[PDB]
């Protein structure tokens, strides 16, 4: 048997941690994305790219550490360690934001590896690959938000930085500049995520409260044998209950579990499409008819106009420090402010 068939044998051994052909891509890239984040949040600054401290070493805590995006002046440089910016100098690579592209790009290939892993294992064990299919939604989000979005903008600077508070800043940037809450693709995404959590809770609670008495203990967990043939809960009682409480109910267990796949996967795919639009500043920012009316009628006020005033506050108060390379100087007198505050 050829050397290829023997390597195949070893890669597909049943061991504690399955490896597979997909592992040659997955494990190096996943470990290095993870490792680069831990390394950067622990030891690396964002002083030269953002004017920010960003590491434990500098006195940040778990919420405020980040591996921050490269400076706007880097454009969309791959920021290779050996490329023209760092010129092989590791220390200068860190200071210029190289760990961001390092993590983003190894993370991208690591996600590819994870999906291939899902295909590989599904094939060997003999199951259908719906789990791989479902993981397309996390991938579409990661690609749309961390890659496509900055590629449409001026630079990687405006991608999300890898940190807790840094992502919160990203959220508020999207409100203030993109009016992203008003975007129907985001709204569908919200529905799919909140709807998914809903399905998760309601399906778990329904099963747990239509169980059959299959043992005599008050702890009902032990009355389940993974190899039993019989359903462990009553589809029929569950159906009656929800039919009479809510008016409709599931009657088909296969549809129910396919729906649980469909809802959040579809939601995340919709949100990814909206962010591709925002890559180009193709926002759902305004309603023209409201703006025409409001411009002419100073007594016309809605919650839509109230929220644009907030956005306008976000943009002017956050821009000088958030986009330090623009050298925005906004004297006190130009800042938008309501009375007193």
């Amino acid at each position: 048997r050829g050397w290829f068939d023997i390597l195949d044998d070893w890669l597909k051994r049943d061991r504690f941690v399955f490896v597979g052909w997909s592992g040659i891509l997955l494990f190096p890239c996943a470990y290095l994305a993870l490792g680069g984040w831990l390394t950067g949040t622990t030891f690396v600054t964002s002083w030269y790219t953002h004017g920010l401290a960003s590491s434990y070493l500098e006195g940040c805590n778990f919420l405020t550490v980040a591996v921050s995006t490269p400076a706007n002046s880097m454009g969309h440089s791959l920021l290779l360690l050996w490329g023209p910016e760092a010129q092989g100098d590791f220390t200068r690579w860190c200071q210029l934001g190289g760990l961001w592209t390092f993590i983003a790009l190894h993370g991208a290939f690591g996600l590819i590896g994870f999906m291939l892993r899902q295909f590989e294992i599904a094939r060997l064990v003999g199951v259908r690959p719906y789990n791989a299919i479902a993981f397309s939604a996390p991938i579409a989000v990661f690609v749309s938000v961390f890659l496509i979005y900055p590629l449409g903008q001026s630079s990687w600077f405006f991608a999300p930085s890898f940190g807790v508070a840094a992502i919160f800043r990203f959220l508020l940037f999207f409100q203030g500049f993109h009016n992203w809450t008003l975007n129907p693709f985001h709204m569908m995404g919200v529905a799919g995520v909140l709807g998914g959590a809903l399905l998760c809770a309601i399906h778990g609670a329904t099963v747990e409260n239509t169980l059959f008495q299959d043992g005599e203990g008050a702890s009902t967990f032990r009355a389940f044998n993974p190899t039993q043939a019989e359903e462990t809960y009553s589809m029929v009682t569950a159906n009656r209950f929800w039919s009479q409480i809510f008016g409709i109910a599931f009657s088909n267990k296969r549809w129910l579990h396919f729906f649980m796949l469909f809802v959040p996967v579809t939601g995340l795919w919709m949100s990814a499409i909206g962010v591709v639009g925002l890559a180009l500043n193709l926002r759902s920012y305004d309603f023209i008819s409201q703006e025409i009316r409001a411009a002419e009628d100073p007594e016309f006020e809605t919650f839509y106009t109230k929220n644009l005033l907030l956005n306008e506050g976000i943009r002017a108060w956050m821009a000088p420090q958030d986009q330090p390379h623009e050298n925005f100087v906004f004297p006190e007198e130009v800042l938008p402010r309501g009375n007193a505050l």
């Binding site: 061991r15 434990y56 006195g59």
Partner: protein
């Protein structure tokens, strides 16, 4: 009996050993004064 060096062994030590190192770095940082 069992093996003691496995793929698993490498996986755990690939994570475990940098984790301890990093923790000692972070502990030391709590005593940095400005």
């Amino acid at each position: 009996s069992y093996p003691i060096f496995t793929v698993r062994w490498v996986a755990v030590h690939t994570l475990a050993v940098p984790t301890i190192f990093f923790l000692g770095a972070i502990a030391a940082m709590q005593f940095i004064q400005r």
